[PDB]
Amino acid sequence: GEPLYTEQDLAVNGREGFPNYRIPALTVTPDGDLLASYDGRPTGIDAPGPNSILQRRSTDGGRTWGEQQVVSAGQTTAPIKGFSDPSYLVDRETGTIFNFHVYSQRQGFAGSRPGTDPADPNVLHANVATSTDGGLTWSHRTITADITPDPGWRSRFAASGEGIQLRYGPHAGRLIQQYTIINAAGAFQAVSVYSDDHGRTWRAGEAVGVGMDENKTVELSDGRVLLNSRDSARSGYRKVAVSTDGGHSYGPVTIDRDLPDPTNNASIIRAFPDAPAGSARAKVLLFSNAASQTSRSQGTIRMSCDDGQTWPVSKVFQPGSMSFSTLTALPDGTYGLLYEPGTGIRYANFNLAWLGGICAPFTIPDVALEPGQQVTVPVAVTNQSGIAVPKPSLQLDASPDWQVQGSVEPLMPGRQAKGQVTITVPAGTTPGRYRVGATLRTSAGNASTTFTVTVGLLDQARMSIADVDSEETAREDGRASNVIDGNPSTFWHTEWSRADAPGYPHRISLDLGGTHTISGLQYTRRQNSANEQVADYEIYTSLNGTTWDGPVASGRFTTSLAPQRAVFPARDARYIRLVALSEQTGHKYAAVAELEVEGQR
Numbered sequence: 001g002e003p004l005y006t007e008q009d010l011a012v013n014g015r016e017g018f019p020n021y022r023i024p025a026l027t028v029t030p031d032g033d034l035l036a037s038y039d040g041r042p043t044g045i046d047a048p049g050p051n052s053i054l055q056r057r058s059t060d061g062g063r064t065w066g067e068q069q070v071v072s073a074g075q076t077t078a079p080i081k082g083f084s085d086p087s088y089l090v091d092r093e094t095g096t097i098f099n100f101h102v103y104s105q106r107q108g109f110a111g112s113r114p115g116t117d118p119a120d121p122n123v124l125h126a127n128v129a130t131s132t133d134g135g136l137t138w139s140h141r142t143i144t145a146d147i148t149p150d151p152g153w154r155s156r157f158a159a160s161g162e163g164i165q166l167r168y169g170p171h172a173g174r175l176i177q178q179y180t181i182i183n184a185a186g187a188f189q190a191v192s193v194y195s196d197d198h199g200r201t202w203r204a205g206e207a208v209g210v211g212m213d214e215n216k217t218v219e220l221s222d223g224r225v226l227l228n229s230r231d232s233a234r235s236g237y238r239k240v241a242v243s244t245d246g247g248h249s250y251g252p253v254t255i256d257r258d259l260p261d262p263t264n265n266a267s268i269i270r271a272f273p274d275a276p277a278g279s280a281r282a283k284v285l286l287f288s289n290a291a292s293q294t295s296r297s298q299g300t301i302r303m304s305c306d307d308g309q310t311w312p313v314s315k316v317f318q319p320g321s322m323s324f325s326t327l328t329a330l331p332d333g334t335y336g337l338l339y340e341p342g343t344g345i346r347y348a349n350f351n352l353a354w355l356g357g358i359c360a361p362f363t364i365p366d367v368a369l370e371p372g373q374q375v376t377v378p379v380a381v382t383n384q385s386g387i388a389v390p391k392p393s394l395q396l397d398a399s400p401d402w403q404v405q406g407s408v409e410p411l412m413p414g415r416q417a418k419g420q421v422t423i424t425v426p427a428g429t430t431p432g433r434y435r436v437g438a439t440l441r442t443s444a445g446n447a448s449t450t451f452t453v454t455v456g457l458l459d460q461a462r463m464s465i466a467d468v469d470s471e472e473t474a475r476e477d478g479r480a481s482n483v484i485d486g487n488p489s490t491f492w493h494t495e496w497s498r499a500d501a502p503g504y505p506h507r508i509s510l511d512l513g514g515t516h517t518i519s520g521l522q523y524t525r526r527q528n529s530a531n532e533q534v535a536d537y538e539i540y541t542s543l544n545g546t547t548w549d550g551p552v553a554s555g556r557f558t559t560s561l562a563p564q565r566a567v568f569p570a571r572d573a574r575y576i577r578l579v580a581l582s583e584q585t586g587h588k589y590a591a592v593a594e595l596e597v598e599g600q601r
C-alpha cells in the first residue's frame with residue numbers, strides 16, 4: 001500500500017545523564033508495548049566501561065516514548081562494575097522478558113580470563129535480567145558457569161539486539177540467545193545458549209566456526225535455525241551456518257557474498273513470525289546492516305522470500321553513519337528498527353510498501369567475451385510473489401560506453417520466467433572484470449541482481465598453482481590457490497607463523513591448464529591489510545614449466561586496492577610466474593588477493 005518510513009531519536013549523546021549512548025536492543029512485549037534498551041556509557045567505551053543497561057518503553061506502538069530508566073546500574077566508583085550490550089528475549093508462552101548483557105569489573109571481552117565464579121573480577125561475566133511484569137522491574141543473575149562447559153572458554157558476550165523463541169518442531173518453545181566466546185587457541189567462536197524450561201536454566205550448545213563475532217539466529221519456514229554472523233577476520237561480508245537440531249549445533253560456516261558488511265553487528269528476523277510452518281509467508285526474512293565493506297554507513301534493509309537463500313530486495317534507510325541496528329516485527333504489521341546514527345540511539349518504523357520490492361529473485365550467468373564482441377545471455381526469474389506481472393522490464397547498469405539491453409517475459413504465479421541480456425563491449429575496452437547490475441522493474445515492486453562480464457581474461461577455474469615459495473596455512477588460510485578463486489576477500493599470504501619463514505623475494509607460479517596466447521597479469525593486493533603489499537615485481541612465462549622466459553615485464557605496483565595491470569607483448573604460454581621482489585614499506589610478507597591473466601581463452 002502506502003509507503004511509511006519515519007524516525008526519531010531516543011537517546012542523544014550528552015543529554016539525560018550520559019556522554020555516549022550505544023548498542024541497541026528492541027522488543028515487543030506480549031502486551032504490544034515496545035521496549036528499547038541500550039548502554040549508558042559514562043566513559044564512552046565498551047566493557048570494562050562502567051556502563052548501565054537502560055530502557056525506554058512505548059505504550060502506543062512506537063509513536064511516543066516514556067522516561068529512560070535503569071535496568072542494570074553501572075558502578076563508576078571503585079570497585080568498578082559495568083553492564084553493557086543488551087539483547088532482549090521474550091518468552092511469548094509464559095510472558096517473562098529477558099535482557100542479556102555483560103557484567104564486567106576489571107576486564108572486557110579481549111581481557112577476560114578463564115574461570116566462572118560470579119565474583120571473579122577478571123572474568124567478563126554473562127548476566128541476564130529477568131522480568132515477570134512486562135519489563136517494569138528486573139531481577140538479575142550471572143549464568144557464566146551454566147554456559148561454560150569448556151574450561152578453555154575464557155570469554156563470552158551475548159550478541160546485542162534480540163533473541164528468539166522457536167515455534168516449530170520438537171524443540172518448540174526453546175529460547176535461544178546468541179553468544180561469542182574466546183577458546184583456549186584464542187579463536188572467536190559462535191554458540192547458541194538456550195533454555196527449554198522457560199528461562200529457569202540455560203546451557204550452551206556446541207561452539208561453531210572461527211573468526212566469528214556477534215551473531216544472530218532466526219527460525220526458517222521448516223524449523224531450521226539460520227545463524228548470521230559478523231566476521232572478526234574482516235572479510236567484508238557476513239558469515240552463515242544453519243542448525244537442524246534447534247540451535248544445539250551448526251553445519252559449516254561459509255562467507256555470504258550477497259551480504260557486504262564492514263565488521264559490524266546486524267539483525268535478521270522473520271517478516272511474519274506467526275505464519276504457519278512451510279507457508280509462503282513463513283519463508284520471508286528481513287535483514288538490517290551497514291551495506292558497505294569499508295565503513296559503517298549505507299544502512300540497508302534486505303528481504304528474502306526463500307528462507308534466506310536469495311535477497312532480491314533491498315532499500316537504504318540511512319545513507320550516512322549507521323552502526324548497530326536491530327529489527328522487530330510490530331503487532332500492526334509494520335517493523336521497528338532501532339539503530340546507531342552516530343549521535344546515540346534512534347528508532348524508525350517502516351512498512352513493506354516502503355521497501356518496494358517484489359519477491360522475484362533472478363539470475364544472469366557470468367559471461368566472458370573479447371573487446372568488440374556481442375553476446376546474448378539467458379535471464380531466469382524465479383517468481384515467488386504469487387502475482388501476475390504482464391509488463392516486466394529489465395534495466396541494466398554497465399560501463400558508460402557499453403551497449404547493454406534486456407527484456408523479460410511476463411511473470412506468472414508459481415512459475416519461472418525467461419529473459420535475455422545482450423551486451424556489446426567496444427573494441428578498445430581494457431581487459432578486466434566488469435560488474436553489471438540488473439534491475440527487474442514491475443508495478444508491484446523491483447528486484448535486482450549483479451553479474452560479471454569478463455573481457456580478455458583467461459578462465460581462473462582452469463588454473464592451478466604450479467609452485468609457491470611460501471604460504472601460511474597453520475594460523476590462517478593464506479593458501480596460494482586463494483589468488484585464483486575469483487574472490488578479492490581470500491588471499492595468498494606467505495608464511496608468517498614461524499620466525500624462520502623466508503623474507504623477500506616471494507614467488508607464485510600458475511598453471512593455466514593449457515597453452516594460451518597471453519599478454520598481461522592483473523594483481524589485486526590484500527584488501528584488509530596494508531603491510532604485505534607487493535611493490536617491485538617481475539613476471540616470467542613458460543611453455544614447459546621448467547624453462548622460464550623473461551622477465552617479460554617488471555615495475556612497481558602502487559598501493560591501489562583495484563586490480564593493477566602489468567602488460568607485455570602477446571606470447572604463447574602454459575605457465576605464468578609472479579616474482580615479488582619487495583614490499584611497499586620493506587616488510588617481510590607478501591599477500592595477493594587475486595591474479596587474473598589477460599589472454600585468449
Ligand SMILES: CC(=O)N[C@H]1[C@H]([C@H](O)[C@H](O)CO)OC(C(=O)O)=C[C@@H]1O
Nearest residue numbers: 023046047085102109157213214232
Ligand atoms: C562486549 C563488548 O566488547 N562488545 C562490543 C563489541 C566487541 O568488542 C567486538 O564485537 C569484539 O569483536 O564491539 C562493538 C563495536 O562497535 O565494534 C561494540 C560492543 O559493545
Ligand code: NA
Nearest residue numbers: 482487490593
Ligand atoms: Na582471492
